[PDB]
């Protein structure tokens, strides 16, 4: 008997390469991360850096 | 329904004990050729410590329970009840000594 | 084996060196007077004392 | 005697499933049926009753002795049925007060 | 070095025997055993010293340990402190079959195991020690 | 009456108002303490007028304090964690 | 249909008989929302009734399950 | 059927978008009570992210 | 023999694996079935024995020689957890894994007095007249609880009242009476009860029930062996010690010595500082078992009763007649004789009278028909009233 | 004047002395021993004696009174019980401190690995503050990894 | 009754865990003690810390 509304959740897109700069107190200077999702069902599977 | 044979320590169903007898103790007890009273006096349905033995000859557990000369199957560490005096005397007539498995004798 | 059995007997003993001590311990472990079974203040209420038997056996009105 | 009977543990054991007012009614009926035995059932509580106006001036042993001699007199006047006293513990209360006998 | 330790341990052995004799005589004279309790701290400190274990086994101090553990003829057990200290020392030292043969502590150990006035924890430790000592004989 | 309001009342210098706010307008409680062990283990029967700290085995050196109920709860929770907060009514040096 | 096949196998030896038990999921069937009363009757539900009686506006989902009994002797 | 029924009902009723036993460390506020103070507020709540 | 069978290094190892509760026997039977089925094949189950114990819940022990044999045995089973929760059993533990239990009591002895766990006679003491050979039940001698037409109080079976309230009594022998389907022998019920309905240890006997049971033997409490054993058990368990208590030693080399309890650790080791004419001995603390300690009660000490009819009575000791101690009470202000096992040295009474009588403090109580007063002081079984 | 009269004098707190509770103190201040896990007697009110809701621990009910002090719910502060453990366990808050003390002393003969003969140890002794004193002593004796049977003359060390 | 050392170690570690999580349920490097609902147990330590704690 209570009216409930679903709020849209904002997420980052999958299957795109994103390159970022790690900060100074770290041996890593740059990282290239991609998150992979199958087209059928649109569900996250694995992350590779 | 399962009962534990007091003498050899094997565990088999009570109807199996009545119809076919104990496969090991039949040489001295004649459990198959015995009435229900003798079966109850030598096989007890109240027991503890189910034991399954695969190889009697090399199992230290079988030697510790003195069941290394018997047929593999279900065995009980402790069996409630002891053999009657007449059956004990009959076994002593055959030259076989009966060691109780009730735990009270050690 | 017999030789190691004799060695075990020599090292650990047959118990006869202290079997008499064990028998004495079991004798002293084993042991009626109503004065020690219940409290005198409970004996008196239950008329179980000697004085109640004296009153009950004497040929006089209580 | 009913007001002391209703609180007595003997009455509570006798009638575990009954309230206090039922025990009061049973005490009243028992008092009607036999006043003497109802007075005897009080045991030590019968010295606390209103016997005399100046009963507090006597020593406790004197009051107990007077009450006991009165009970002995009245019980021996009435008499005790020995078989009933042997069977029914309620009627055996008057047996210690029989002439020549005691607790 | 080792000879001085052997001499000190032999002197301790003589003192322990003298204290045991004195306590037995006092018990026969109606007095409590106090000398063993007085000597107990020094014996405990010596036994807790790990490097003296070889000298103890060479001088056969376990015989006097058995003598202290031996119940007196009046069927009275020794004080619980003595039994606890000696059991802890036995655990702390590597007793072998040869040392047991020299001392004959197995008889007293079997007596302690079979007795009922002894504490059950001491009974279990005695059972464990008997099992450990029977272990090398059969393999 | 939060912490910042407490600091403002400290800055005003009004100690009596702060004490009244935090005790009379709130959880004011009365406890008894042993004068020896300093613990809140006194068993007081006020209408029977008998006080006793069974541990210290004393009946005469016992005082009463007015403390917040939350302070009593804090001391009991500390005692549950094997800490012993002992409240004494005199200084030592 | 992501995981349309549950499979259970049992190499029974008690004459070796390798038995596979498997169930398949088929079609999904949906209906309009319905309300089931305590007395056992049913009727079509509307949102105002669900709001007034504190019900949930929901519909049953049906799935076709097909069972097969595979057996191989080897 | 109680598994799916209760899971969907719980997640929509409480807003925790996961299993009920997994409520700790799960996304919350995905479902909210619809605002009905005025018509414009209802529209805004229905178009929120 | 039995001693020679103790394990060696070359004996096959034993591994224990955690399984789901209640499925241990199922795993044992499955292992036996697989061992029998794979026997005589190219790859038989190379194990030797497997078992489990009821007391050691959640554990299944298999005797083998290789871990791969254990993995093969557990293969194809669902009761085994996902993780390989296997451990190597120590060789010393091999004898302990098969040691028996419940040995304390070879069997139930006929004539002993036991308590009933449940039923209409819950808590009533019963004599074990007969022990059934099966061991699951036993015929017992009980005190009947009937109302004759929420349970009635126990009382000896009255045949006359039973006939008056119910004339359908049956008779089979002399002294053996059957009323309402229950067999009563000379006023005592004889009814079979299961083994799971009885307490055979820590039995607390009462003088009333003891007298009621031994009254029919024409000799009051003629039997006193089990009663004496119950006395010994109650005396041993009721003794609790505190620091500073003066104690005396019964056994050991330190027999007949006085000392003060310094500290208490657990409930079986008590450190005692002995008192003697030698100063060097008085500065030593000795840990002594509680089984060889007897409390020392000096004349003129405040002591509070632990247990008995005179429970929570305090006062000053007057006479110490060894085991029996006499003291003038504080509440009743009269001499009371209680055994020394029931006394604790408590310097203050601090008795609370709450949850007693029917009268709060300062109640206006009607004494009798024309007397009234106010309760001034309250006691466990008496009151002080100001008229 | 909102509290019932008490003959105990009214004072204020001048000092708070902290410390640990000893097992003797825990047993002495207790009023009952807790040994029964079951909260309720027979699910018919009247909670079981020796349980976690024993009536001697205090009353939290309007109509019931505490069986220890006899006071009502408003006045009773509550009373402590104790629970004997079968085996000793670590206090979770003191485990690193137990570790540091174990480092500081000798596991066989309960003595510090170093004595006052070392001047640094004497200086570590001199500081009055217990925390800093412990810190200094620990910083010294942590290095020392062997008990000394004789003086670095026997210091009682077991070696 | 009977003492296999492994079972003693298991049950005594369970007792140690219960006594430790009764006082501190925020122990780093180990799982928290949980309620039947899945919420973590509220220990004595958590009653005394934070804005909503006893002190603040
Ligand atoms: Zn057989
Ligand atoms: Zn104090
Ligand atoms: Zn209270
Ligand atoms: Zn050292």
């Amino acid at each position: 008997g209570s009216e409930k509304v679903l709020i849209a959740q904002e997420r980052s897109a999958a299957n795109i390469v994103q390159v970022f700069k790690k900060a100074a107190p770290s041996p890593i200077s740059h990282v290239a991360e991609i998150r992979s999702a199958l087209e059928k069902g649109s569900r996250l599977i694995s992350t590779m850096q | 329904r399962e009962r534990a044979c007091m003498l050899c320590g094997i565990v088999l169903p009570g109807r199996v004990f009545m119809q076919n007898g104990c496969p090991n103790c039949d040489s001295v007890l004649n459990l198959r050729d015995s009435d229900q009273a003798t079966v109850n006096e030598c096989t007890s349905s109240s027991f503890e410590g189910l034991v399954a033995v695969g190889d009697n000859e090399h199992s230290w557990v079988a030697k510790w329970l003195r069941v290394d000369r018997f047929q593999p199957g279900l065995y009980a560490v402790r069996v409630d009840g002891r053999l009657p005096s007449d059956i004990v005397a009959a076994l002593e007539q055959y030259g076989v000594y009966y060691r109780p498995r009730d735990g009270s004798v050690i | 084996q017999g030789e190691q059995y004799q060695e075990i007997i020599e090292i650990f003993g047959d118990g006869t060196d202290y079997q008499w001590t064990l028998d004495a311990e079991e004798e002293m472990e084993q042991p009626t007077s109503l004065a020690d079974v219940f409290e005198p203040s409970e004996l008196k209420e239950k008329m179980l004392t000697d004085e109640d038997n004296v009153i009950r056996v004497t040929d006089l009105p209580e | 005697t009913a007001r002391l009977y209703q609180h007595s543990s003997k009455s509570s054991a006798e009638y575990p499933n009954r309230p206090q007012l039922a025990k009061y009614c049973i005490g009243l009926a028992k008092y009607i049926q036999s006043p003497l035995l109802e007075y005897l059932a009080l045991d030590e509580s019968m010295y606390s009753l209103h016997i005399h106006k100046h009963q507090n001036l006597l020593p406790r042993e004197k009051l107990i002795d007077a009450v006991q001699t009165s009970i002995v007199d009245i019980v021996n006047l009435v008499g005790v049925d020995i078989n009933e006293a042997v069977r029914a513990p309620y009627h055996a209360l008057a047996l210690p007060y029989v002439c020549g006998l005691g607790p | 070095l080792e000879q001085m330790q052997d001499e000190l341990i032999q002197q301790l052995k003589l003192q322990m025997e003298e204290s045991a004799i004195r306590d037995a005589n006092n018990i026969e004279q109606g007095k409590p055993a106090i000398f063993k309790l007085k000597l107990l701290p020094k014996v405990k400190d010596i036994l807790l010293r790990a490097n003296l274990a070889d000298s103890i086994l060479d001088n056969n101090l376990l015989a006097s340990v058995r003598l202290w553990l031996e119940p007196l003829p009046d069927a009275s057990l020794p004080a619980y402190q003595i039994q606890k200290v000696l059991f802890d020392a036995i655990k702390s030292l590597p007793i072998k079959t040869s040392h047991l043969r020299e001392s004959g502590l197995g008889k007293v150990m079997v007596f302690y195991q079979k007795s009922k006035r002894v504490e059950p924890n001491l009974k279990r430790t005695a059972e464990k020690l008997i099992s450990d000592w029977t272990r090398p004989i059969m393999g | 009456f939060g912490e910042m309001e407490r600091d403002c009342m400290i800055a005003h210098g009004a100690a009596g108002f702060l004490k009244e706010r935090l005790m009379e307008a709130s959880d004011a409680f009365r406890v008894h303490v042993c004068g020896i062990c300093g613990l809140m283990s006194v068993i007081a029967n006020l209408k029977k007028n008998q006080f006793e700290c069974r541990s210290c085995k004393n009946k005469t050196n016992i005082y009463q304090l007015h403390i917040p109920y939350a302070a009593k709860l804090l001391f009991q929770e500390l005692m549950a964690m094997n800490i012993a907060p002992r409240l004494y009514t005199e200084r030592s040096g | 249909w992501e995981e349309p096949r549950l499979i259970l196998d049992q190499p029974a030896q008690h004459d070796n008989i390798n038995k596979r038990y498997e169930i398949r999921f088929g079609k999904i069937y949906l209906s309009r929302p319905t309300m089931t009363e305590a007395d056992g009757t049913t009727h079509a539900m509307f949102p105002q009734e669900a709001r007034l009686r504190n019900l949930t506006y929901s519909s049953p989902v049906y799935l076709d399950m097909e069972k097969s009994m595979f057996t191989s002797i080897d | 059927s109680t598994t799916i029924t209760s899971g969907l009902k719980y997640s929509l009723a409480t807003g925790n978008w996961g299993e009920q036993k997994k409520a700790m460390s799960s996304r919350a506020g995905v479902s909210q009570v619809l605002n009905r103070y005025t018509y414009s507020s209802t529209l805004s709540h229905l178009r929120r992210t | 023999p039995q001693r020679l069978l103790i394990p060696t290094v070359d004996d096959p190892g034993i591994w224990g694996v955690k399984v789901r509760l209640g499925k241990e026997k199922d795993v044992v039977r499955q292992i036996l079935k697989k061992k029998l089925a794979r026997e005589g094949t190219k790859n038989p189950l190379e194990i030797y024995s497997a078992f489990q114990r009821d007391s050691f819940k959640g554990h299944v022990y298999i005797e083998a020689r290789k871990a791969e044999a254990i993995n093969d045995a557990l293969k194809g089973n669902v009761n085994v957890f996902s993780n390989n929760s296997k451990f190597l059993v120590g060789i010393v533990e091999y004898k302990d894994l098969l040691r028996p239990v419940k040995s304390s009591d070879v069997k139930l002895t006929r004539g002993s007095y036991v308590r009933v766990k449940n039923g209409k006679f819950k808590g009533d003491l019963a004599q074990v007249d007969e022990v059934l050979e099966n061991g699951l039940e036993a015929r017992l001698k009980l005190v009947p609880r009937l109302d004759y037409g929420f349970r009635p109080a126990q009382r000896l079976f009255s045949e006359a009242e039973a006939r008056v309230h119910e004339p359908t009594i049956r008779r089979d022998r002399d002294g053996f009476v059957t009323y309402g389907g229950e067999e009563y022998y000379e006023g005592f019920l004889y009814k079979t009860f299961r083994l799971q309905n009885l307490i055979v240890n820590s039995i607390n006997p009462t003088l009333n029930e003891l007298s009621l049971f031994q009254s029919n033997e024409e000799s009051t409490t003629i039997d006193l062996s089990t009663i004496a054993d119950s006395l010994k058990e109650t005396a041993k368990n009721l003794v609790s010690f505190q620091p500073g208590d003066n104690v005396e030693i019964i056994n050991g080399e330190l027999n007949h010595l006085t000392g003060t309890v310094s500290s208490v650790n657990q409930s079986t080791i008590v450190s005692v500082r002995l008192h003697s004419d030698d100063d060097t001995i008085n500065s030593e603390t000795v840990e002594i078992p509680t089984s060889d300690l007897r409390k020392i009660f000096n004349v003129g000490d405040h002591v509070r009763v632990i247990h008995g009819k005179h429970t929570d009575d305090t006062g000053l000791i007057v006479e110490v007649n060894g085991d029996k101690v006499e003291f003038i009470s504080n509440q009743t202000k009269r001499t009371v004789i209680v055994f020394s096992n029931y006394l604790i040295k408590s310097t203050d009474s601090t008795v609370s009278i709450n949850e007693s009588g029917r009268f709060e403090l300062h109640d206006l109580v009607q004494v009798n028909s024309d007397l009234v007063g106010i309760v001034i002081r309250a006691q466990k079984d008496s009151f002080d009233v100001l008229c | 004047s909102q509290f019932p009269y008490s003959s105990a004098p009214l004072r204020s707190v001048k000092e708070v002395q902290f410390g640990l509770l000893s097992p003797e103190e825990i047993r002495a201040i207790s009023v009952v021993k807790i040994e029964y896990p079951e909260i309720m007697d027979e699910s018919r009110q009247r909670p079981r004696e020796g349980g976690l809701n024993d009536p001697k621990l205090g009353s939290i009910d309007r109509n019931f009174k505490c069986q220890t002090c006899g006071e009502g719910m408003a006045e009773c502060p509550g009373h402590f019980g104790h629970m004997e453990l079968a085996k000793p366990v670590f206090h979770i808050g003191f485990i690193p401190k137990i570790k540091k003390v174990c480092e500081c002393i000798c596991m066989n003969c309960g003595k510090l690995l170093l004595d006052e003969t070392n001047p640094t140890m004497a200086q570590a002794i001199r500081i009055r503050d217990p925390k800093k004193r412990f810190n200094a002593v620990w910083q010294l004796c942590k290095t020392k990894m062997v008990c000394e049977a004789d003086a670095p003359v026997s210091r009682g060390g077991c070696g | 009754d009977g003492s296999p050392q492994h079972i003693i170690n298991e049950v005594e570690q369970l007792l140690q865990f219960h006594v430790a999580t009764y006082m501190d349920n925020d122990i780093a490097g180990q799982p928290q003690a949980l309620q039947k609902s899945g919420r973590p147990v509220k220990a004595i330590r958590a009653r005394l810390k934070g804005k909503e704690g006893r002190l603040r």
Side-chain angles (χ1 to χ4, degrees), chain G residues 29-41:
Chain G
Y29 301 94
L30 306 146
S31 56
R32 289 286 176 271
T34 322
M35 159 64 173
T36 285
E37 311 279 352
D39 74 328
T41 56

PDB file of all heavy atoms in Angstrom, chain G residues 29-41:
ATOM      1  N   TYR G  29       5.581 -17.186 -18.671  1.00  0.00           N
ATOM      2  CA  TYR G  29       4.207 -16.732 -18.819  1.00  0.00           C
ATOM      3  C   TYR G  29       3.899 -15.723 -17.726  1.00  0.00           C
ATOM      4  O   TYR G  29       4.185 -15.965 -16.551  1.00  0.00           O
ATOM      5  CB  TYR G  29       3.223 -17.903 -18.749  1.00  0.00           C
ATOM      6  CG  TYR G  29       3.453 -18.958 -19.806  1.00  0.00           C
ATOM      7  CD1 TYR G  29       4.239 -20.070 -19.543  1.00  0.00           C
ATOM      8  CD2 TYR G  29       2.865 -18.851 -21.058  1.00  0.00           C
ATOM      9  CE1 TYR G  29       4.445 -21.036 -20.502  1.00  0.00           C
ATOM     10  CE2 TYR G  29       3.066 -19.813 -22.024  1.00  0.00           C
ATOM     11  CZ  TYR G  29       3.855 -20.904 -21.741  1.00  0.00           C
ATOM     12  OH  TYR G  29       4.057 -21.865 -22.700  1.00  0.00           O
ATOM     13  N   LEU G  30       3.311 -14.596 -18.116  1.00  0.00           N
ATOM     14  CA  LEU G  30       2.897 -13.564 -17.187  1.00  0.00           C
ATOM     15  C   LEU G  30       1.394 -13.351 -17.293  1.00  0.00           C
ATOM     16  O   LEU G  30       0.769 -13.668 -18.303  1.00  0.00           O
ATOM     17  CB  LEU G  30       3.621 -12.238 -17.438  1.00  0.00           C
ATOM     18  CG  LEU G  30       5.147 -12.285 -17.458  1.00  0.00           C
ATOM     19  CD1 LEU G  30       5.688 -11.285 -18.453  1.00  0.00           C
ATOM     20  CD2 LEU G  30       5.693 -12.027 -16.080  1.00  0.00           C
ATOM     21  N   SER G  31       0.822 -12.814 -16.224  1.00  0.00           N
ATOM     22  CA  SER G  31      -0.600 -12.537 -16.156  1.00  0.00           C
ATOM     23  C   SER G  31      -0.819 -11.132 -15.612  1.00  0.00           C
ATOM     24  O   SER G  31       0.121 -10.451 -15.197  1.00  0.00           O
ATOM     25  CB  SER G  31      -1.321 -13.562 -15.284  1.00  0.00           C
ATOM     26  OG  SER G  31      -0.752 -13.607 -13.989  1.00  0.00           O
ATOM     27  N   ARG G  32      -2.067 -10.685 -15.663  1.00  0.00           N
ATOM     28  CA  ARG G  32      -2.433  -9.457 -14.983  1.00  0.00           C
ATOM     29  C   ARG G  32      -2.495  -9.705 -13.478  1.00  0.00           C
ATOM     30  O   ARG G  32      -2.725 -10.840 -13.049  1.00  0.00           O
ATOM     31  CB  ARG G  32      -3.772  -8.939 -15.496  1.00  0.00           C
ATOM     32  CG  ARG G  32      -3.733  -8.388 -16.906  1.00  0.00           C
ATOM     33  CD  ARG G  32      -3.052  -7.030 -16.902  1.00  0.00           C
ATOM     34  NE  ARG G  32      -2.895  -6.462 -18.233  1.00  0.00           N
ATOM     35  CZ  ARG G  32      -1.852  -6.670 -19.021  1.00  0.00           C
ATOM     36  NH1 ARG G  32      -0.867  -7.478 -18.668  1.00  0.00           N
ATOM     37  NH2 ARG G  32      -1.802  -6.065 -20.206  1.00  0.00           N
ATOM     38  N   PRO G  33      -2.219  -8.681 -12.663  1.00  0.00           N
ATOM     39  CA  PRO G  33      -2.191  -8.872 -11.206  1.00  0.00           C
ATOM     40  C   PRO G  33      -3.519  -9.364 -10.646  1.00  0.00           C
ATOM     41  O   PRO G  33      -4.594  -8.947 -11.078  1.00  0.00           O
ATOM     42  CB  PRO G  33      -1.838  -7.476 -10.673  1.00  0.00           C
ATOM     43  CG  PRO G  33      -1.982  -6.553 -11.816  1.00  0.00           C
ATOM     44  CD  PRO G  33      -1.734  -7.343 -13.037  1.00  0.00           C
ATOM     45  N   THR G  34      -3.422 -10.266  -9.676  1.00  0.00           N
ATOM     46  CA  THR G  34      -4.573 -10.924  -9.084  1.00  0.00           C
ATOM     47  C   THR G  34      -4.447 -10.858  -7.566  1.00  0.00           C
ATOM     48  O   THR G  34      -3.346 -10.751  -7.023  1.00  0.00           O
ATOM     49  CB  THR G  34      -4.663 -12.389  -9.559  1.00  0.00           C
ATOM     50  OG1 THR G  34      -4.291 -12.460 -10.941  1.00  0.00           O
ATOM     51  CG2 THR G  34      -6.078 -12.928  -9.430  1.00  0.00           C
ATOM     52  N   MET G  35      -5.585 -10.923  -6.884  1.00  0.00           N
ATOM     53  CA  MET G  35      -5.642 -10.864  -5.433  1.00  0.00           C
ATOM     54  C   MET G  35      -6.324 -12.127  -4.923  1.00  0.00           C
ATOM     55  O   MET G  35      -7.411 -12.477  -5.392  1.00  0.00           O
ATOM     56  CB  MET G  35      -6.394  -9.615  -4.970  1.00  0.00           C
ATOM     57  CG  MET G  35      -6.952  -9.685  -3.560  1.00  0.00           C
ATOM     58  SD  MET G  35      -5.674  -9.814  -2.302  1.00  0.00           S
ATOM     59  CE  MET G  35      -6.659  -9.648  -0.818  1.00  0.00           C
ATOM     60  N   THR G  36      -5.694 -12.796  -3.961  1.00  0.00           N
ATOM     61  CA  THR G  36      -6.198 -14.048  -3.410  1.00  0.00           C
ATOM     62  C   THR G  36      -6.622 -13.802  -1.968  1.00  0.00           C
ATOM     63  O   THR G  36      -5.810 -13.379  -1.139  1.00  0.00           O
ATOM     64  CB  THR G  36      -5.143 -15.150  -3.490  1.00  0.00           C
ATOM     65  OG1 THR G  36      -5.043 -15.615  -4.842  1.00  0.00           O
ATOM     66  CG2 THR G  36      -5.519 -16.324  -2.601  1.00  0.00           C
ATOM     67  N   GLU G  37      -7.891 -14.060  -1.675  1.00  0.00           N
ATOM     68  CA  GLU G  37      -8.455 -13.786  -0.364  1.00  0.00           C
ATOM     69  C   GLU G  37      -8.274 -14.985   0.562  1.00  0.00           C
ATOM     70  O   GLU G  37      -7.884 -16.077   0.142  1.00  0.00           O
ATOM     71  CB  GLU G  37      -9.932 -13.418  -0.488  1.00  0.00           C
ATOM     72  CG  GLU G  37     -10.218 -12.364  -1.542  1.00  0.00           C
ATOM     73  CD  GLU G  37      -9.956 -10.951  -1.057  1.00  0.00           C
ATOM     74  OE1 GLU G  37      -9.696 -10.769   0.152  1.00  0.00           O
ATOM     75  OE2 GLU G  37     -10.005 -10.020  -1.886  1.00  0.00           O
ATOM     76  N   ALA G  38      -8.543 -14.754   1.851  1.00  0.00           N
ATOM     77  CA  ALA G  38      -8.421 -15.811   2.852  1.00  0.00           C
ATOM     78  C   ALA G  38      -9.419 -16.936   2.617  1.00  0.00           C
ATOM     79  O   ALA G  38      -9.109 -18.102   2.883  1.00  0.00           O
ATOM     80  CB  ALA G  38      -8.601 -15.228   4.252  1.00  0.00           C
ATOM     81  N   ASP G  39     -10.618 -16.616   2.124  1.00  0.00           N
ATOM     82  CA  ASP G  39     -11.615 -17.645   1.860  1.00  0.00           C
ATOM     83  C   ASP G  39     -11.300 -18.482   0.624  1.00  0.00           C
ATOM     84  O   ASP G  39     -11.988 -19.479   0.383  1.00  0.00           O
ATOM     85  CB  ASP G  39     -13.005 -17.014   1.738  1.00  0.00           C
ATOM     86  CG  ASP G  39     -13.211 -16.268   0.432  1.00  0.00           C
ATOM     87  OD1 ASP G  39     -12.236 -15.700  -0.104  1.00  0.00           O
ATOM     88  OD2 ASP G  39     -14.358 -16.252  -0.064  1.00  0.00           O
ATOM     89  N   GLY G  40     -10.294 -18.104  -0.165  1.00  0.00           N
ATOM     90  CA  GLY G  40      -9.817 -18.904  -1.271  1.00  0.00           C
ATOM     91  C   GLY G  40     -10.155 -18.361  -2.642  1.00  0.00           C
ATOM     92  O   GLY G  40      -9.558 -18.803  -3.631  1.00  0.00           O
ATOM     93  N   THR G  41     -11.097 -17.426  -2.738  1.00  0.00           N
ATOM     94  CA  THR G  41     -11.471 -16.883  -4.032  1.00  0.00           C
ATOM     95  C   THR G  41     -10.389 -15.941  -4.552  1.00  0.00           C
ATOM     96  O   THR G  41      -9.509 -15.487  -3.816  1.00  0.00           O
ATOM     97  CB  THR G  41     -12.807 -16.150  -3.942  1.00  0.00           C
ATOM     98  OG1 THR G  41     -12.725 -15.131  -2.941  1.00  0.00           O
ATOM     99  CG2 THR G  41     -13.916 -17.120  -3.574  1.00  0.00           C
TER     100      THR G  41
END
